[PDB]
């Protein structure tokens, strides 16, 4: 249920930061992906709309996760990098 923001760093040419972080999430075996982009977004002032969650990879026996993030510009710009699979697999682009 706690979030840490390990590195943020800027892609100037593809429009994103790319945003590596820890999840603590005590008592679980792994954490609620929906629950940790709500946290993380809340965190860095992230658009919501914008955040392509990569994965969140869990260790057994850790109370500690490790994140990665890419926070686009714009939707546009998420839209012209990120494939359809991945958008629709995530929430972000509803399939007709």
Do not use: C, W
């Not at 760093?9 to 940790?36: Q, W």
């Amino acid at each position: 249920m706690e979030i840490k923001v390990t590195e943020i760093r800027e892609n100037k040419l593809l429009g994103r930061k790319e945003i590596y972080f820890d999840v603590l999430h005590e008592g679980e075996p792994t954490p609620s992906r929906e629950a940790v982009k709500g946290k993380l977004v809340a965190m860095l002032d992230l658009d919501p709309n914008t955040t392509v969650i990569q994965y969140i990879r869990s260790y057994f026996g850790s109370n500690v996760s490790k994140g990665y993030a890419k926070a686009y510009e714009t939707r546009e710009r998420m839209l012209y990098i990120e494939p359809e699979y991945i958008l629709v697999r995530d929430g972000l682009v509803q399939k007709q």
